[PDB]
Structure formats: structure tokens, C-alpha cells
Design a protein around this ligand. Structure first.
Ligand SMILES: CO[C@H]1O[C@H](CO)[C@@H](O)[C@H](O)[C@@H]1O
Ligand SMILES: CO[C@H]1O[C@H](CO)[C@@H](O)[C@H](O)[C@@H]1O
Ligand SMILES: CO[C@H]1O[C@H](CO)[C@@H](O)[C@H](O)[C@@H]1O
Ligand SMILES: CO[C@H]1O[C@H](CO)[C@@H](O)[C@H](O)[C@@H]1O
Ligand SMILES: CO[C@H]1O[C@H](CO)[C@@H](O)[C@H](O)[C@@H]1O
Ligand SMILES: CO[C@H]1O[C@H](CO)[C@@H](O)[C@H](O)[C@@H]1O
Ligand SMILES: CO[C@H]1O[C@H](CO)[C@@H](O)[C@H](O)[C@@H]1O
Ligand SMILES: CO[C@H]1O[C@H](CO)[C@@H](O)[C@H](O)[C@@H]1O
Ligand SMILES: CO[C@H]1O[C@H](CO)[C@@H](O)[C@H](O)[C@@H]1O
Ligand SMILES: CO[C@H]1O[C@H](CO)[C@@H](O)[C@H](O)[C@@H]1O
Ligand SMILES: CO[C@H]1O[C@H](CO)[C@@H](O)[C@H](O)[C@@H]1O
Ligand SMILES: CO[C@H]1O[C@H](CO)[C@@H](O)[C@H](O)[C@@H]1O
Lengths: 109, 109, 109, 109
């Protein structure tokens, strides 16, 4: 999927994808955006831990946590509690949007 | 695709899709959400005109226009000018999120 | 997914999807191909049983089984044992292809 | 997309994709299968030309052509003229299947 909803996480090795774009939460704790085999953007935190996870929070903050639950990296966009989405777009941009402004209200459970 | 970006338009017959979920801008001008063949939600504007288009605007408003550019239906969520997305989620909810809070800034043209 | 591989089955209510096309193994045992809410093709086995499952076999035969395990519909294309695929194509055609003629051999699990 | 239909061509820089898998016809004439940034398989024709194209033929042959239309690589599976598909599978295998054994005959265009 190319969307990471608030309240969800990407475990080590999991990623967002779109066309030839891959945004993966690597094993070495480096969160990289690849265009095929070319690294376009990264948090540059590789080697700072092992088996990190990416968290899209309900406060709007995108945080990379180590297994001890320590913030290795963050987008620093925390604040208003609500519904946010982190999207790996078709234009290669990875953007955080929120909060929800309108909804049909047809969600399931 | 399941995302409609601000500045984009869905022409009559065009839709957003996810699994068995289809959010379509019908030729009768009724914007409907179907679960397989079952209509789950609609604007109930069918028959009000012909060949409408759905537009996700930069003001945050999702508007159904007819060929003459007369608004047939609107989410009425206009406001801050910016970047918004309209998503047909995996939970079957259609939500508008915005504006953008953060971005890797790795887009290409 | 738009592909059903040999050795795989679609349980009741499960489907193959592509754009607005939905190929679903319904609870009433009718196997229908939908284009939005319009029934484009069906096995016409609706009501013959309940809770059927669709099986794409390793002999190339696509069979619909009822809970008692008796076939109620089949493509009748059983033949050479091997690898086959049932695809819901972008042109709206549902085709069975096989067997495999070549492969990179880069498979994993 | 993850499927290349017989009669279709992938120009240089064009690819098949699925998850973190990318099957790309590069500009250097090398046809590589990547798992994220790691090359899992290649035709090894890099540097033999420029701006090559990949063709899934109706005779079942998957061929890499140069700008002058000279074959630079092929699966060597040319045979009976029919309908074939080259699929980048979910198991990470790239396989050619054919010919078509059955169809619903619900295609357009
Ligand atoms: C310096 O290497 C690290 O950073 C690059 C660029 O992000 C990644 O590709 C690689 O896997 C490592 O995590
Ligand atoms: C309290 O600080 C904020 O940012 C850190 C990481 O930067 C998170 O652990 C925390 O949940 C908040 O969102
Ligand atoms: C209450 O949660 C649900 O609805 C909101 C919008 O109202 C979405 O943001 C969220 O993903 C769920 O679908
Ligand atoms: C009354 O019918 C209208 O509305 C239903 C759902 O409300 C749509 O499925 C249909 O195509 C029409 O536009
Ligand atoms: C009242 O103005 C707003 O709503 C109308 C129709 O509802 C849109 O056409 C317009 O662009 C604004 O968003
Ligand atoms: C310049 O616009 C780009 O960046 C913003 C975030 O800054 C995105 O919302 C938008 O869709 C584009 O990718
Ligand atoms: C006659 O009703 C049956 O067949 C139609 C299509 O022919 C399906 O849409 C429906 O679900 C039933 O199974
Ligand atoms: C009769 O042999 C084949 O046909 C029936 C369908 O009628 C299948 O159940 C069986 O497994 C074989 O594929
Ligand atoms: C052995 O199975 C694998 O290889 C064949 C082709 O060799 C494919 O059809 C199948 O899906 C698997 O990837
Ligand atoms: C060895 O270099 C060549 O082959 C590898 C994979 O084998 C490609 O990644 C690369 O772009 C070159 O074409
Ligand atoms: C022997 O010919 C076959 O293979 C070559 C490449 O080797 C293709 O150009 C041709 O169309 C056939 O498929
Ligand atoms: C006329 O061709 C169509 O039908 C065949 C099966 O008959 C498919 O293989 C092909 O892709 C098209 O959908």
C-alpha cells in the first residue's frame, strides 16, 4: 500500500510502495525512499539501532522508534490529536496530511 | 487509484477504487459509493443534470459540477487554501484530509 | 488482486478486482463478473447451493464447489498438470492462461 | 502494472511492479529484476546498446530489442502464435504463461 494511516506502524522490513517508489523502514533503522535502486531521501539514522519501526501517530507526528520505544527520528509535526495519513504519492513526494475534514461515514469494522 | 489530489478532477464515468469499493462520478450526476453492486452512499443528485465532473479543490472543497460549471453538490468544507487529498480508504470510508503538514520534498516533474 | 493462481481458491464473498471490475464468488453460489453495479457475466448457478468456493486447479480447470464438495460449475478446461493463472484483465476479460513457458526462477515465499 | 500482455512493449525506463519488486527495462539495455535496491536477476546485456525495448510477442517469445530492431536477448520460448502474459508474481517470480485456455469473452476495446 502507499498509505500509512494514523494509528498504524511499519515494522522493520515493511514499506510503502507506488510504481518504482519504495519507502521502507529498514532493519538497520534507516528510513529510506528508493526510486528503483536509487536512494532519493533518508533519515540517515542507519546504524543507530536494529529492528526499528515507523509510527504514524494520532497527534500527527511521524516517528521512527527503536525496540525500547525511543524516538530515533521524528517529523516534529505532533500536536492536534486526530486522523492523519502519510502518503507515498504518485509524484514521488511523501506527504503527511490531516486532520480529516469530511467523510462519507461508511467505514466498516 | 484510491486517491484524488487537490487540483484533480474525476470526469463522468471515472472513479476511485479499492478492492470491491468504487467511488464513481456517474453520467446521471449522482456521486455514488458502491460495495460490489450495492450502493452504500450517494449525493442523491442523480437526474439533476448530465455529464457532471467531481473536483477536489485547493480550498478543501469537494464539488460536483455540471458541464456549465454550476455546482450541483458540495461537501462544504471550503477553507484554508492548500493541498488536500480525497481518499477511498481500505475501511470503506471516503475521507478528505488536509492540509499537508510535512513532506520529504522528493517530488519530480 | 486480479490474479488467481493454480493451487489457490476464492472462498465465499472473496473476489478478484481490477478498476471497476469485480469477479466475486457470491454466497448464493453465483460466480459473477461486475462492472460497477452491472452484472456483465455469471455462471448462473445462483441459488443452487450456499457458501460455495472457487478453485483454480493445477490441471487448468476452474471449478465451483458447494459445501458438500460437489462441483456445481466448471470451465471444463482440465488437462495437463502444471502452473496456470486466472486473470481479471484490464480489458475486462477473465482468461485462464497456462501452462508456464518460462520463468526467471527468482521465487521466494 | 504487474502484467505484460502479448503484443505489448516496455520502452526504456518502463517497468512491471509489485510491492518492492521492480522488473525494469533500463536505459543501458539491461533488463533487471530488483527487490528494493537489490538486483535479483538480470539479462546481463548492460552496455550492449542504449534505449532498448522489451517485447512480449504473440509467438510466446519475450525479446529485448535495440533501437535498430536487432534482438539482444530473448527467453527463446517462441512457438505457437496466441495470447500470452508475462507476470511479475507475488512470489517474486517472473513467469510467461500461455496460451489462453478459457475466457468469459467479456472484453471491450
Ligand atoms: C549509508 O547507507 C545507509 O543509507 C543508505 C542511503 O539511505 C541506504 O541505502 C543504506 O541501506 C544504509 O541504510
Ligand atoms: C512527546 O514528544 C513527541 O515526539 C516524540 C518523538 O519525537 C514522541 O515519542 C511523542 O509521542 C510525541 O509525539
Ligand atoms: C472516526 O474514524 C473514521 O472516520 C474518520 C473520518 O471521519 C477517518 O479519518 C478514519 O480513518 C475512520 O475511517
Ligand atoms: C435512484 O438511483 C440513483 O441512485 C442510486 C443510488 O442512490 C444509483 O446507484 C443509481 O445509479 C442512480 O444514480
Ligand atoms: C460557495 O463557494 C464554494 O462552494 C462552491 C459551490 O458549493 C464552489 O464552486 C466554490 O469553488 C467554493 O468552494
Ligand atoms: C509542491 O507540492 C508538492 O508538495 C506538497 C507538500 O509540500 C504536496 O502536498 C503536493 O501534492 C506536491 O507533492
Ligand atoms: C438473478 O440474480 C442472480 O444473478 C445476478 C446476475 O445475473 C446477480 O447479480 C445476483 O447476485 C444473483 O446471484
Ligand atoms: C471430472 O474431472 C474434472 O472435472 C471436475 C469438474 O466437473 C473437477 O471436479 C475435477 O477435479 C476435474 O478437474
Ligand atoms: C515452481 O513454481 C514456481 O514457478 C512456476 C514457473 O516455473 C510458477 O508458475 C509458479 O507460480 C511459481 O513461481
Ligand atoms: C552489474 O551492473 C549491471 O547489472 C546490475 C544487476 O545485475 C544492475 O543493477 C546495473 O544497473 C547494471 O546494469
Ligand atoms: C527465432 O525468432 C524468434 O526469436 C527472435 C529473437 O531471438 C525474435 O525476434 C522473433 O520474433 C522470434 O520470436
Ligand atoms: C481477443 O482476445 C481477447 O481474448 C483473449 C482470450 O480469448 C485474451 O487472451 C486477450 O487478452 C483478449 O482479452
Amino acid at each position: 500500500d502507499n498509505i500509512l494511516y494514523s494509528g498504524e506502524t511499519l515494522s522493520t522490513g515493511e514499506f510503502l510502495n507506488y510504481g518504482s517508489f519504495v519507502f521502507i523502514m529498514q532493519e538497520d533503522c534507516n528510513l529510506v525512499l528508493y526510486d528503483v535502486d536509487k536512494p532519493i531521501w533518508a533519515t540517515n539514522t542507519g546504524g543507530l539501532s536494529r529492528s526499528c519501526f515507523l509510527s504514524m501517530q494520532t497527534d500527527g507526528n511521524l516517528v521512527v522508534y527503536n525496540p525500547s520505544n525511543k524516538p530515533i527520528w521524528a517529523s516534529n509535526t505532533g500536536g492536534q490529536n486526530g486522523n492523519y495519513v502519510c502518503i507515498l504519492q504518485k509524484d514521488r513526494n511523501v506527504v503527511i496530511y490531516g486532520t480529516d475534514r469530511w467523510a462519507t461515514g461508511t467505514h466498516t469494522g
